[model samples]
Target: FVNQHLCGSHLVEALYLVCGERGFFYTPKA
Candidate 1:
């Protein structure tokens, strides 16, 4: 769950830039 944040950050940023967060960004944060 720790490293997940790193990869998830890179991945979501890439995907969001390509598709607008898809609704994940609207969830809980750090």
Candidate 2:
């Protein structure tokens, strides 16, 4: 069995905030 977690858009938004525009732009697609 594989472990599954649900964070929703909050996770993405948080990453975007932490990464900022520059870091977010450089980050690879999911």
Candidate 3:
């Protein structure tokens, strides 16, 4: 899981790009 804001943002963006708009962008509580 990511706690850092920047990292989480980038991860979500990357997930969206790779998995498309319907992708589930969820990060476990860190």
Best by the lDDT measure? 3
> Candidate 2: lDDT over CA atoms?
0.55
How many backbone overlaps does candidate 2 show?
0
lDDT of each: 0.53, 0.55, 0.65
Candidate 1 lDDT tens digits, 1-30? 224444556766655665664544523366
* Model 3 poorest ten-residue lDDT run: 1-10
Candidate numbers, best lDDT first, in rank order:
3, 2, 1
Off by over 4 Å in 3: 1-6
Q: Which stretches of candidate 1 lie over 4 Å from their true place?
A: 1-6, 21-30
lDDT of 2 by residue, 1-30 (tens): 113452656556666777776665433466
How high is the lDDT of residue 19 in model 1? 67
Screening candidate 3 with a backbone cut-off below 3 angstroms (N, C-alpha, C), the clashing residue pairs are none
- Candidate 1 has a TM-score of 0.34
- Could you tell me the lDDT of residue 16 within candidate 2? 72
lDDT of 1: 0.53
Candidate 1 RMSD computed on C-alpha atoms after optimal superposition onto the true structure: 6.1
Clash count for each candidate, listed in order shown: 0, 0, 0
